[PDB]
Each structure stands twice: as structure tokens, then as C-alpha cells.
């Protein structure tokens, strides 16, 4: 058993052709595209005229990066590594022209230039020749190219075939051919073909390249575990991929290509949590933002009304999405994500100002309003929300019930409010208590009238300011809390308790102070959701193993799969749907799905009849292969029914006898090793 990059058995690989169908109604195919290298490439070619001539490997296939070139031109094999400037359609140009004599190759159009050469080989043949015979593809060549830890390995095999299409069903191992110590980073590769000049091709004279009948197949290796069979001479005469079907896995586990009748545990299946769950206690009682926002009375800008918010949770998504506010400026903070954080001090300042003055309510703004009526700090993580109020703050005759402060000794500090009747006096022209020259009262009249323009209409502005303190925060927004999912395996995190299980409705009655739930083994059994108070149970995910019920490979290769201790609905979720397409999902689900007490049985047909137990499944259920033939699961019969004819005066005296010899085997000793 070897774990290495292999081509999975019964895979489905790409097919390429290079052929010009006779006549103008046919197809002119020159398949030679640049293909990814992946972690390994399997290359096969069925040919009779030897159109294939080599390969190209590299990352960009240009002078930018190093590349590897392999070509054979009917008497040599050349391997080179250079920063070749490959053509977009490289090939070898065969020519029927009699320049010297016979067919020859004369148009080497693979690469424009070779630079920064590292090494070159002139190794001996893959010959092959320049012959153009027809009929069936008489040779089959298989190659495996691998590039690992700075070494490039090439395996190859050559066999004669009598096929005309597809690949033979025979089995053959590809012996190593060459290994190269190259640190190149192969990622894309391309195929080289020997084209024929239509200008100088037998019968054809039109300008162009024509390709003879050629067919090659490309596959990609994957990391697989294979069970290879070495014969007396060391040749790999057979192999088994340990991923193809349950029978293959059973053979691989038993390390044998022949499996006897019985049930074998091959692997263990686990159901992973779907995506996630995270939960913390959502929120305390809502804060009274409506009072400030929908306040019956609003104070002047110089006397903005402040409401302190504490012992609650901020919530404004209902009004934010309404889009009913003319301004929702949140400076330096997301308009919604700010709520998800603890805030020790929260304030709501409401005032009525002119529409043009709303722009002055910004952190760090300076002016006759910001520096004298409402000053915001630079560290303003709050939001200033302004909306028109002409429908309430306007009437016939106008309103004259507002004041604003314009004169003061110094600019106001952030969240600084001061109301006084002291008369401001100029330094050079003091008044000493009177409103004289260069002396003005701090407050000035202010108001609105219906005739005012849009920019001059009243606007209600509410500022929700937040600041952090060392003291514990009361207005806090919860951390990432997702929605609850039930009856579905998932990885949950309840207030720091990380667990994986299935959340379901529970009838257990906790206590008001109880959150967790435990069993005799001190394992989390039930949990209470902190956001909303209800009790949910915790259950393991699936656990359980996988057993491959099968008769002997001799007789039939049909098998059945048993998944212990799981409902028959979770079988495809146990990391299934990723195995081999045509062999595993058939046993993953389908018809004849039976729910035994020992687990879920698939591939076996339940039968009313009861027979002698053939293969023990468990809980009185046994499986047999005999009935067209198919695996059947039944309740084993504990022998044939009988009822002795008993009466008070009847006896049975035997009239004949049989001398029966029976064999008993008893181990007497085990090998005495030291």
C-alpha cells in the first residue's frame, strides 16, 4: 500500500485529436492547447504515423521564466531547459518535398529564441520515425510527468495495440524513464505535433499545415492511496485504488485483492458542523431616544437640551432606515456599526437652528455658532441628525422665541454651556457694567417666519454623542450574535462555551439562575439561550463507523454499506458527494435503503422472509447474497419450528441407529517466540 500521486481508476480524462477529415465537408482539427500541469500529468497516445514528437513545460512559456523542452526528430531525443520564446502554435514541419530525399522535417517552428540555457541532453530514442502509414493505431505510449521538490520525474510505457479508438482495458505499469534535478516551477504544459506542409503534401498543394491522424489523451494525477500487487519478478501486475468503491476500500483495509464473505469495518465517518453559531446576551431595556428625538419642546441652540442615557441599550435602526432625516452625518464612524460597542457616557443634545447652520454642527468646526452655541469635540464618535421642522416651528406672524449667543470671552470648549447676563466689553473700550460703545449683550434675538426660504427654515438637530470612561459602561451594544438554528449540526459558542452539536427543543426545566446543563460525566447536556430564555439540548454530531457488508469477491462484487447509529437521512452529509462519481454516491443513497437498529443499511433489500443468519449485522438482522442476485437484509430465523407430539401415554422408541463421526479442533499451543 503506497500513498502517492496517482491517476484514479476509471477516471474520465480529456481527449484531443489532430486530423484533417477527407473532403471539404470534414473537420480540420489541430488540438494542441496549453494545458495546466496541476500536481502531475498522465499522457497517452495511440498512433500509427507518429505525429507526436515532444512536450513543453513551464509557467509562462516565454523568455520571462524558465521552461523545459523535449523533442525527438526521428534519430535523437533532446531535452533542454531555457527561457525559450515559444511560438503560440509550436510544431515540427514534416515535408514530402524531395529537397534531399524522402520525408524529412525542415520547419522547426517551436521557439523563436533560446536564452539562459541551464543544460541540454541528446538522450537516445523514443523512436518512432517519420513514417506515415495508415490503418489501426499500432502503438500505444503512456507517460507520467511529475515535478516534486525540485526534481522532474518521467515514467513511460510502450505496448502494441490493435484498437482504433479510446484506450485499451488492459493493465500495465509505467517503469521509470528519467529523473532531472531541475528547480523549475512547471505549471502549464503543451503538446508538440509533426505537421505536414499542405503546399508540399502528396496530392495537396494549397498553402498551410495539415496534420495526420493522431489521438492523445491527457489526465491529471491526484494524491491517492493505491494497493499495488508485485509478482515473483517484481512487476506490478495489478493495482487497486483505495477510493473507488466500498469493495475497493475493503480490499485496501484487508490488504488483499480477495475478500471473504462477511462484514468489515473499513472507515469512520464524521458529520462536521455546518457553518457556525455565536451567542451572547443581546441587550438590556431600550434607551429613551424617542423622548429627545420626538420632544414636545426644543431649547435654543445656545441652550441645547441634553439628556443623559444610561442603564439601557441604544437603538436607532428603526429611524435610520426610514430616511426621514435631511442629514445623518456621522463623522469618522459608520452610521450603524457604532452601536455595537460599550459606551460609558451617552448624551443626546437637541436644538433648533437654521438650515444653513446645520453644516456648522461638526467636530472641530469653528464659527459664530460652533464656538459660541454648540461645540463638539474632535473625538466625536456620535451622529448629528437634522430634519426640517417648518411644519411645527412656523405660523402666521412669525416666531420670536429663540436666542443665540454671539459675544463671549473665549471660544466654548467641547460640550461647554454657559448662560449669563454679563455684558461683553471690548478690551480697549470697557463699559464697566453698561451697554456702551463697543459693548454688546451676549444674547441676540432669533426666530423664523413662514416667508423664509428653504435654507432659512427651522431645523431640529439631535446629536447622539458617545464617550468612553474607565468606569463600567451601562449603554453597551452586543458583540457578533448570529441567528439561532435548530435540528442542524453546527459549531456553537454560548458565552465563551465552544461546542459542536445539534440544538433541539427540550422539556428540561432549568432554574432562573441556571444557564448550563451537565450529566453524570460532567459534559454539556443542555444550554439556555442568553438572548431569549429557553432550554435547548446538546447532542453529538453523528459519530459511528462504516462497515462494508459483502459476500466473497468470488461469486459477485456487489456490496452493501452499513452506517452505525445514524438515521438514513444523514448518510450523504457525512463528507460524501466527493468520492468517485460513478461508484460511491450509488452506495451513498438510492433505492433499498433500510433503517436497522444497528444503523443505516444501503445496497441491501429488506425481505419479509426469515432465513438462517449468513452475515451478522446486529439486533437480530443478518444479510445474505442469495435471492437477479442481490444482497438482502432480513431477520434471522432461530432454527426450524418443531412441536413434539406429546401425550400422557405415547412414547417414541427408535428402530434404527447411525454411527456419526464429528470433528473437533482445539488449539494446544502458540508459537513460542522470544
Amino acid at each position, epitope marked *: 500500500s503506497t500513498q502517492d500521486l496517482f491517476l484514479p481508476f476509471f477516471s474520465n480524462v480529456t481527449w484531443f485529436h489532430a486530423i484533417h477529415v477527407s473532403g471539404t465537408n470534414g473537420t480540420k482539427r489541430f488540438d494542441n492547447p496549453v494545458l495546466p500541469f496541476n500536481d502531475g500529468v498522465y499522457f497517452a497516445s495511440t498512433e500509427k504515423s507518429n505525429i507526436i514528437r515532444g512536450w513543453i513545460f513551464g509557467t509562462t512559456l516565454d523568455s520571462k521564466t524558465q521552461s523545459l523542452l523535449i523533442v525527438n526528430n526521428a534519430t535523437n531525443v533532446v531535452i533542454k531547459v531555457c527561457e525559450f520564446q515559444f511560438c503560440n502554435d509550436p510544431f515540427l514541419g514534416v515535408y514530402y518535398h524531395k529537397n534531399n530525399k524522402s520525408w524529412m522535417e525542415s520547419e522547426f517552428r517551436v521557439y523563436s529564441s533560446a536564452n539562459n540555457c541551464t543544460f541540454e541532453y541528446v538522450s537516445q530514442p523514443f523512436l518512432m520515425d517519420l513514417e506515415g502509414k495508415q490503418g489501426n493505431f499500432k502503438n500505444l505510449r503512456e507517460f507520467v510527468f511529475k515535478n516534486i521538490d525540485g526534481y522532474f520525474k518521467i515514467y513511460s510505457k510502450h505496448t502494441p495495440i490493435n484498437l482504433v479508438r479510446d484506450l485499451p482495458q488492459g493493465f500495465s505499469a509505467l517503469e521509470p524513464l528519467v529523473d532531472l534535478p531541475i528547480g523549475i516551477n512547471i505549471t502549464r504544459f503543451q503538446t508538440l505535433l509533426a505537421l505536414h506542409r499542405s503546399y508540399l503534401t502528396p496530392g495537396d498543394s494549397s498553402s498551410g499545415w495539415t496534420a495526420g491522424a493522431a489521438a492523445y489523451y491527457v489526465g491529471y494525477l491526484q494524491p491517492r492511496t493505491f494497493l499495488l500487487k508485485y509478482n515473483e519478478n517484481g512487476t506490478i501486475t495489478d493495482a487497486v485504488d483505495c477510493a473507488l468503491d466500498p469493495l475497493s476500500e475493503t480490499k485496501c483495509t484487508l490488504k488483499s485483492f480477495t475478500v471473504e464473505k462477511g462484514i468489515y469495518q473499513t472507515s469512520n465517518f464524521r458529520v462536521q458542523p455546518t457553518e457556525s453559531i455565536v451567542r451572547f446576551p443581546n441587550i438590556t431595556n431600550l434607551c429613551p431616544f424617542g423622548e429627545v428625538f420626538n420632544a414636545t419642546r426644543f431649547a435654543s441652540v445656545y441652550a441645547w437640551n441634553r439628556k443623559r442615557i444610561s442603564n439601557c441599550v441604544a437603538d436607532y435602526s428603526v429611524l435610520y432606515n426610514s430616511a426621514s432625516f435631511s442629514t445623518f452625518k456621522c463623522y469618522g464612524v459608520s452610521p450603524t456599526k457604532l452601536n455595537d460597542l460599550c459606551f460609558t457616557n451617552v448624551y443626546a443634545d437637541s436644538f433648533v437652528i437654521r438650515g444653513d447652520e446645520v453644516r456648522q454642527i461638526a*467636530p472641530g468646526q469653528t464659527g459664530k455658532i460652533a464656538d459660541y452655541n454648540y461645540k463638539l*469635540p474632535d*473625538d466625536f464618535t456620535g451622529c448629528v441628525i437634522a430634519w426640517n421642522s417648518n411644519n411645527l416651528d412656523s405660523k402666521v406672524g412669525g416666531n420670536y422665541n429663540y436666542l443665540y449667543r454671539l459675544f463671549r470671552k473665549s471660544n466654548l470648549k467641547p460640550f461647554e454651556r454657559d448662560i449669563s447676563t454679563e455684558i461683553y466689553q471690548a478690551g480697549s473700550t470697557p463699559c464697566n457694567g453698561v451697554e456702551g460703545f463697543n459693548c454688546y449683550f451676549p444674547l441676540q434675538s432669533y426666530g423664523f417666519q413662514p416667508t423664509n426660504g428653504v435654507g432659512y427654515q427651522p431645523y431640529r438637530v439631535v446629536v447622539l454623542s458617545f464617550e468612553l470612561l*474607565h468606569a463600567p459602561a451601562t449603554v453597551c451594544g452586543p458583540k457578533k450574535s448570529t441567528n439561532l438554528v435548530k435540528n442542524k449540526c453546527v459549531n456553537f459558542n454560548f458565552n465563551g462555551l465552544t461546542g459542536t452539536g445539534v440544538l433541539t427543543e427540550s422539556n428540561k426545566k432549568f432554574l432562573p439562575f441556571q444557564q448550563f446543563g451537565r450529566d453524570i460525566a460532567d459534559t454539556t447536556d443542555a444550554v439556555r439561550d442568553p438572548q431569549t430564555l429557553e432550554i435547548l439540548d446538546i447532542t453529538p454530531c453523528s459519530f459511528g463507523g462504516v462497515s462494508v457488508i459483502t459476500p466473497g469477491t468470488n461469486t459477485s462484487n456487489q456490496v452493501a454499506v452499513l452506517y452505525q447509529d445514524v438515521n438514513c437521512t444523514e448518510v450523504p452529509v457525512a463528507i460524501h458527494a466527493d468520492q468517485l462519481t460513478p461508484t460511491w454516491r450509488v452506495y451513498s443513497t438510492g433505492s433499498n435503503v433500510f433503517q436497522t437498529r444497528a444503523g443505516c443499511l444501503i445496497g441491501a433489500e429488506h425481505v419479509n422472509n426469515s432465513y438462517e443468519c449468513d452475515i451478522p449485522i446486529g439486533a437480530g438482522i443478518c444479510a445474505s447474497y442469495q435471492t437477479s442476485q442481490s444482497i438482502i437484509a432480513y431477520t434471522m430465523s432461530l432454527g426450524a419450528e418443531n412441536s413434539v407430539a406429546y401425550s400422557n401415554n405415547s412414547i417414541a422408541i427408535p428402530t434404527n441407529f447411525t454411527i456419526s463421526v464429528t470433528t473437533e479442533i482445539l488449539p494446544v499451543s502458540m508459537t513460542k517466540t522470544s
Partner: nanobody
Amino acid sequence: HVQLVESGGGLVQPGGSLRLSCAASGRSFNSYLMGWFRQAPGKEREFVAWISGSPHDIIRYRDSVKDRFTISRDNAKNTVYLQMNSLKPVDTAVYYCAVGSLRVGSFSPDYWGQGTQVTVSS
């Protein structure tokens, strides 16, 4: 007892760059603003920069240190990293790291360290 320890100081000629670091221990600093202050010999201490540990990083700098000094913090380690770029001789001073609260929207230091010398001269 909340304690602050500085590191990363030394001598750096003009045109160089440095990384000053301070580690804070004693309690969680999620609701704390972390910043740096410097005081040159013969001159009063001056505010350099401060940054908030909230999910939204609120960051500030003094007028002279705009676009040349950078401040960052890591809440997992309760550490603050300060980047000096395009240092001039005027930057020679003792630099301290401060843990403070956000009072009235102004960074108010609460805990101070010992400080490290950062000299700028050829």
C-alpha cells in the same frame, strides 16, 4: 496596579526612522484611549498622539507631528506602537506612554509609565 513600560528608544540621526512601543498591564483597556507624550529637556511636556481601542480606530496627532509620526495599538496585547518617520533634531526628547479615558471628548491620561529617551543628532 496598572503599570506601563516603554521601549524602543535610542539615538537616531536626522532622516532615520524608529519604532517606539509601550505595554500596558493591570486591567482591560477596551474602553481606554492609548497615546504618547514627549518632553524635550528644558521644555514643557507636549502631547504627541493618541488612538482609541474601539473597533473604529479614532486617531489624532499634534499639528507639528502631522504626516510624519504614526500611532497604532493592539488590543489583544494591550500594546501601542508609534512610528517615527523623517525625524529631525527637534524631535530629541523623552517620550512617555499614557493610558487615559475619553472625558468630554478629550483624551485624559490616567496611567503613565517611566519614559524612554529618543535622541536625534548626527
